[PDB]
Amino acid sequence: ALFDSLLARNKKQAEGETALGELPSLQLGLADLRQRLRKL
Amino acid sequence: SEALQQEIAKIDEEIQKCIRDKEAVDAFLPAHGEQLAAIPTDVNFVTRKSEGAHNA
Amino acid sequence: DEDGLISLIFNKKESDIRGQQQQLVESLHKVLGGHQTLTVNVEGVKTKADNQTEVIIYVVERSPNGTSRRVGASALFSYFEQAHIKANMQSLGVTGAMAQTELSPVQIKQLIQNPL
Amino acid sequence: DEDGLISLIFNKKESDIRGQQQQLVESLHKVLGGHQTLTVNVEGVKTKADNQTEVIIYVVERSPNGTSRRVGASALFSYFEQAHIKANMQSLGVTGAMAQTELSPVQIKQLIQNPL
Amino acid sequence: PIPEQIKLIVDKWNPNHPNCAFKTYLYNKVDEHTVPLYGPGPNEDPKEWEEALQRKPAPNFIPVLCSGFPSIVARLMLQRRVITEFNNKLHQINASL
Amino acid sequence: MDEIITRWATDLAKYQKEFKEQAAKVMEWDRLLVENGEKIQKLYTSTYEAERASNEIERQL
């Protein structure tokens, strides 16, 4: 249930809300993400 | 020949009676074996769900 | 419990208790109903204060077959604590009583659930 | 363990178990020696398969002082697993038994060191 | 040399321990300070006992005498009895989680 | 009559060689059991900790 909680947390993460700053972040993945990782 | 032929019977009977116990062991193994093998898979599973709660 | 010992405190001097022990024992026998199947025995007499004396008793009961045994301490205490009997005892100068049997937890629980 | 619950599997249909529950309970009482200080109680009855029924029981034991308590599950299981008792149980249709108490490691070690 | 082999075979298949030939020792765990107890019994050779204690896997373990088949059956009996306890406790953990 | 002693001794050695294996297997199983048991206890601890922590969070909210 660990990975499940990781999903769940990363799911609730990118979904609002009214927290005065933390807006949901768009997910990338795979192609764009590798380059986004390399650009670190 | 009576005492001998009787003694061999009693002895071989006792041995056979012991081998019955040996067989009794042999019979009660595979089930118990599965039961045993089941354990580490669950504790290795429940330990995971705990990690989930802790991370939560 | 089988030893049947009941300790009684009397508001009387020891010399008075000993001086009239025959009478005291018979009065206790009367409190018990006075039948010839019961006999009060004195186990000991001890001064506790100027006008306080402890008297330890037991009661032997005889069966129809001639057999004798001591009345159990709990049974005897139960009789003496009954309100009518206690009052009669107080008229003899008894101001307290005690049994030696250490009750079990279940016995104690029963007494608390049914104090009467 | 104090709740004293033992689960029994019977090779009988549920309707048969319930239909003769008085008799079943008394037979279990007899297996225990039949004394009036022990009383078998049925906690539950559940069908498990066409001809398999689980019956959960406990046993109340009464002390000489009138106190009652449940026989501990481990103690009751230990009695029922004794070879003579197990055989009697099997004659009633019992094909298995289980206690709910999760034994400690030291208890388990003791059972393995002395399996008899 | 015939009535010797026979007696030796009758001796082998037996719990009396005259060279039982079904001699294996199993280590039962026991926490301190109970190690000083145990303490074998009727027909235990201190040789076998000490030799068992010699190649000890870990401390707080005491050896146990398994002569023949009923003993290994019994060991199994215990193993199941603990199996169920294990599963139960594990399920408790599961439930609380 | 030797043909009987042969059978006896062969059976003996044959079943000895097997009993040894059974016993060994049982031993290994015991090892497995305690090896897991330790982990079970660890789970008990970890769980109790989690429980207490959750209770604390409950108190906080």
- A28 and A36 in contact (C-beta within 8 Å)? yes
Q: Of B42, D81, E34, E57, whose CA–CA distance to F30 is shortest?
A: E57
Q: Could you say which residues from 32 to 91 on chain D have a Cβ atom under 8 Å away from some Cβ of chain F?
A: none
Report how far residue A22's alpha carbon sits from residue A2's, in angstroms, rounded to the nearest whole number: 24
**Residues D5/D56, Cβ–Cβ less than 8 Å:** yes
Instruction: Flag if B14 and E13 touch (Cβ within 8 Å).
Output: yes
Distance from CA of F60 to the nearest CA of B (A): 16
Q: How many angstroms is the resolution?
A: 23.0
C55: amino acid identity, one letter: V
Cis peptide before E39 (omega within 30 of 0): yes
Q: Which residues does chain E have within 8 Å of residue B15's beta carbon, measured at their own beta carbons?
A: 13
Q: How was this structure determined?
A: cryo-EM
Separation CA C70–CA C60 (nearest Å): 4
**Taking a C-beta distance cutoff of 8 angstroms, is the pair C43, C57 a contact?**
yes
Q: Are D69 and C105 in contact (CB under 8 A)?
A: no
Tokens of D10: 């019977």
> Å from E90 to nearest chain D CA?
9
What residues 1-40 of chain F have any CB closer than 8 A to a CB of chain E? 5, 8-9, 12, 16, 19-20, 22-24, 26-27, 29-31, 33-34, 36-37, 40
Shortest CB distance from E85 goes to which of D108, D114, D116?
A: D108
Cis-peptide, bond into residue E32, ω within 30° of zero: no
Residue with tokens 């580490």: B40
Which of C107, C46, C49, C48 lies closest to C73 in space, CA to CA? C107
Q: Is the dihedral of CA C102, C104, C105, C108 positive or negative?
A: negative
User: CA–CA separation, F49 vs F61, rounded Å?
Assistant: 19
Alpha-carbon dihedral sign for residues C109, D77, E39, E51 = negative
